[PDB]
Design a protein around this ligand. Sequence first.
Ligand code: SF4
Ligand code: SF4
Ligand code: FES
Lengths: 59, 688, 216, 119, 73, 386
Amino acid sequence: LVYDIKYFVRDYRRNNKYTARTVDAKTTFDFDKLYAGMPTKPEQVKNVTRPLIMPTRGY
Amino acid sequence: PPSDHLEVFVNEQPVKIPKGSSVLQACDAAGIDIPRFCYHQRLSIAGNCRMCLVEVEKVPKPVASCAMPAGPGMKIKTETPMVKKAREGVMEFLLINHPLDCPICDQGGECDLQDQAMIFGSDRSRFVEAKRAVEDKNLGPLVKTVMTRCIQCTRCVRFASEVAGTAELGVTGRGRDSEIGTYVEKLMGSELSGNVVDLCPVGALTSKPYAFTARSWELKGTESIDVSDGLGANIRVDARGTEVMRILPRLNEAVNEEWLSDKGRYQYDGLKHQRLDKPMVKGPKGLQVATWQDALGAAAAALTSAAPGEVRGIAGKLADAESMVALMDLLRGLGAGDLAHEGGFSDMPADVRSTYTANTTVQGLEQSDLVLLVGTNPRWESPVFNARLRKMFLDGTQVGLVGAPVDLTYKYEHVGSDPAALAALAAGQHPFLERLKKAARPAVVVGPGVLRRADREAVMKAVHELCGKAGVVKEGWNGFNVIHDTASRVAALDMGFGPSAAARARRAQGAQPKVVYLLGSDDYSEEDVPEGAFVIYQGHHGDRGASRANVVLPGAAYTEKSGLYVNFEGRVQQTRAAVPLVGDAREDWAILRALSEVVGKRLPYDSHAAVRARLAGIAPHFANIDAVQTPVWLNGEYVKGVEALAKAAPLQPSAPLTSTISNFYMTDAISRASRTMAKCIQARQQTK
Amino acid sequence: GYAYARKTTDKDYIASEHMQAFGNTQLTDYIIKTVPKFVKMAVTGPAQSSVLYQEPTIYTTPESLVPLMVFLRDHTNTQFKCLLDVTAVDFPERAARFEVVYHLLSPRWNNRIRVKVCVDEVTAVPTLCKVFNTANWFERETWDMFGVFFSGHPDLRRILTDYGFTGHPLRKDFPMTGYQEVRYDYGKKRVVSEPLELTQEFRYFDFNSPWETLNR
Amino acid sequence: KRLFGGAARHFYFEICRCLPFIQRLHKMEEMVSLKELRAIVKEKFKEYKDVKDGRVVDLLIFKGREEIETYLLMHKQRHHVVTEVVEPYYAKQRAVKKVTTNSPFLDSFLSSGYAAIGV
Amino acid sequence: DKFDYNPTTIPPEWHGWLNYINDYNPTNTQFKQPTYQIEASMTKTGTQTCYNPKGSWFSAKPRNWRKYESWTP
Amino acid sequence: LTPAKVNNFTLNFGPQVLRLVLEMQGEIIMRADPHIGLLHRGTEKLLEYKTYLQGLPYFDRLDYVSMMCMEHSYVLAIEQLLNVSVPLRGQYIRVLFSEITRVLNHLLAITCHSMDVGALTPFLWAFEEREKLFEFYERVSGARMHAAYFRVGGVSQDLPIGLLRDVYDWARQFASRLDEMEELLTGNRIWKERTVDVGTITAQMAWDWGCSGPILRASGIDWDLRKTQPYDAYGKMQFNVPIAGHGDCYDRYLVRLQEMRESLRIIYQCLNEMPDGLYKSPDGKVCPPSRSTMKQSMEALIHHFKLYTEGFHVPAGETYRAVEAPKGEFGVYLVSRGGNRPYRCKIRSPGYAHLQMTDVISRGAMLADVVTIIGTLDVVFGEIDR
Ligand code: SF4
Ligand code: SF4
Ligand code: FES
């Protein structure tokens, strides 16, 4: 960044967004699909590894 | 209509805008505040800052929204990558040569450049070369010039050329070596010369009296009004604790737009000198510090010791409506009917408000294409009003003057200089009448110095005759206007602060009172203040009246209280207390109420709202703060009803219609005590 | 009680894939579908637990707060056994100036949640002591600092201000330095509160630029 | 039968019931009796006689319960009683029929440039 | 000073080496001496000759910090 | 609604800053009513009149035993709403100094608990290593306790050259110091009989009572925020979790000692993995630039002017973040309106929650054990009363 000093490509702060989603009333929550993705045996069990570090974006 | 409001789209938002509007104005109507450096609301389009670049469909180049007209069906984009890229590049080009002077620059904290760099700029710089070094310039003692800080936004040049009309500043050199100022050593002769620093978006132009004093965030901002004249400019007061640091104008289109007289800009310094903080009573050794109880008792004894016809009250320039009505009630309750005003013409009849106001209003005046001046100098009576007159002149409005030919910063026609010339104009002897008789919306304006003439009834009769012959007052229009140069005059006129016919007769045969009371008055004539007579002074500055006084009550200054003040058009305005009372000072109407109780006749009111309600009962329009009523018009019945006053003291055809204001920089004690006005006077005297 | 030490080995992992994916994407929708009456407004926020996820926030009337908390602690999919704290926020612009806040932790599934109820000064908030023991002192402190009442509490009284202190200091209208100051008097031999007086008055500085867009 | 069920009179009755223990515990035997203590508590009630919400009255009563309870556990020492209970009574019965014939407006004017604030 | 030993009399150029802040002393380091340098000495605290603010009663000429001028007849 | 009637028992335990009122039917405690607020400084309202950088030193004096941990939660809460990534070397330094701070908190806590019990030698002995780590702090921030080192986007300054040398030298003998510390109480029947089976707490009550830190670990509960909700470089760190299953004062003592051991292990791992690179976030619009950069560049000078007067404007929003404090879980709730000052900043303190357990725990106990309860609770009223 010594000579390439453009900032818009790296303005995370002023570019976050909130959106008002649609009225979540007439939705169909199929718990069948929820419970179909769960394991049934000692094997086939997958766990999300603990992340080593927080994001650094190259620095 | 042929669709006077056209439609465009800015970031897929339909916005209805008037024809001839710019993309800058459209985005303003769209709720977007586009960064800008050279454009101003009151100036012509410059378009050299390149900070208003935006994106439009079917356009390969960024367009100058500060200058680009809007076409129907146009699409405007303000958040695209090229927009931010251009903004950052423009900011970088701004900052490469700008000196690193923020720690010593006085605009730090209110610098448009700094905030715009923070928002629309980057954080890093790749410029490592030697900058451009610019020598500073001298323009007078009012403005400190640091030319190296100049970004060449040309706002000073446009302002001086258009608003002031002096056109004394320009752009010298070329390219990088382009330079701003005057080729020669010149002193800025503009009376509205302090507006340039506010219009300067950087620290290149700074108020020399305010330099290095305090910072913007250290201040408490209090919206106030200007009392240095009769226009009443809306201003904001900035202070650090109990001390005033600077005074700045604020937006009021119907009164002063964005402008302030330098007299109303730099006279705050006087509040630090010759200040009265404690009550004083003249003893055998002279005036000495005494309690409010002692001073009030002495004043009551002096007042009661004399007959009601031996007591005179005089109102100064800066007395508010509340104190004026309180003192008037006080003196009336004891049988006294001697009233006088420091603003003159205290005996002028006040039955119809329109007869002593501006019936066209200040903003309604801009609808007139032809303006007549009758013995007035608006440049030295109200430079802001003169600037608005110049703005009207800038788009075809012609102005005629009857009186002393003076520099008014625009071309005009001099009809004459004496009432005989006015009579000739009314008779039909001059071509200006037919121009008046052909103008759709003619305007006639008369200053206060005319009202100070002993033959004021004759002059008013002649003016009314000319207005009738030219049809200046007709249906849906009134070009007749009366202006003033002091704030307290209007409230006194509306409240009926006028001497009785008995007191007028007593003056006529030469009756001389013994008890004289001053309400902040320092420019009295010797004829109303006999020598050897007891003087009770109320004020907030040590001056001529205070020195000759025998009992002194330290009052409140307009920067310390909230008094009512109506301008010459008849719009009610009020000040605001920015700093607390100085010394043991008290509220003026509270002081008068205390004196009334001590004497033996209490005033029926005991609160600020109570005395304001008493004023409203006296005159209903006082309740309407920051508004104006439409005065009634009674045609020639008023003039035919004041015919006797015209018969007595007939017209003087030889005395020229001049302006009684001979010292613009010094009109009251505060102006007479201000160091900055004295410095300006010396500077204007060192040019020869 | 949960989160018992089960594995004797080191764990390189956090939670299970399916449970984490549900809790981070469809947890809010599950809450909405389950008890829509208890739901009034939904915001999925910056994930108090971790910087890389999403977490929900709950808005509802004070009427159904207690059963909602009961379900949130006791549901087989939402085992929020840890109520972190109860606090409030002042919104003087609004008709209801108070936003009481409820925070939960679920060590069963390494999750968290926020629950808010918006009320005014004269509406009772049923106490959550019967649901969580820790709510006692949190309700006490919230009442002390804002005057937010909690009905049915065993003993609701001030916990942080002075013994004879009246008023709630964290209110937006409450002065920063207050009204009373206390000093000792030799003549009365007693330490007495007196009207507040300052040798140097406080200095407020207005730095907020007239160009900032983020102001809300 | 009374406004808002008359909870205010019940609160006053409860505080009056609890009053004598305060007098004995705080050694007010040689300053006050039960009657003028009750009068003090009565005058405390008059500060809000014109409230038109039952909820506000309930919260007032609850805060008064807290004040009387922190009075009960002696959490406010004798100095609090000095500064709020008996010296104010002595001042009230002490400056009776003052000899100043000036109006309150004139009193304020002779006092200072601003009205007095606080106790 | 065997009877009134005080740390304030140690000069600063020995203060850093004494305080284990630097390894520089006059015997091995040639510092730069400003012409306005004031020497070290004992403290005057507890005495009437010690410093006092300009609004103190011990000051030679009392200051009235009013930010304006009062008018005198 | 309630009279007094029966006075009978009456007690007053200390105006000197904990005030305690207890109720005994004799030698055994039946009720215990703490009264707090003698240190309530009203900081949360005070925070509203300060900028984010201005209010940072407030967090130094919330837990003046453990400071950088207090800084870290507030800094993370700011950054998450600011959407700012922290450089690797800064994360390493933060984690290492946090471990050192945790060591200090454990040392002072255990020594004070011992002195309350009656052992005075470990107090004095461990304060020497505490002075060593104070010297470490002063070398890196110029302050012994209130460093104000942690910054939004990194730290104020980089570590001075030669610091890690002395850190490793200290670690080379800290284990021996801990070992000699243990032998004074570990194998003692008196210390155990004073501490064993005093203040027993269950997992169900603890999760009902909102416990955090070592007290939670002693109930058979597998929980560390550094392993369940890791922050900065704690995920990379490999270390063990002490686990006890009685909820006993002796158990909490051993748990804290093993926590110190694990902290030393993490200190070693951080020492041998220190990377080279930037220590501050490269966003000058939030992070202050270098003084050399400021004095030679207009843009950095402008940003230094603006940040040091007005500061960065956090976008409107809300967040809550917590940190695995040595005394438990220290969290801060941040409410953002969009300006340069936090609208509402609520502070959550684990000791305040732990202090709420006195009445139920002290039941059935003796006056010789109230001091034990307070000491093993490891409570600082600075965070308890804010
Ligand atoms: S004009 Fe603005 S940017 Fe330029 S030196 Fe002054 S404060 Fe800095
Ligand atoms: S001196 Fe000021 S107003 Fe004039 S061109 Fe330069 S920046 Fe613009
Ligand atoms: S305002 Fe557009 S370039 Fe100047």
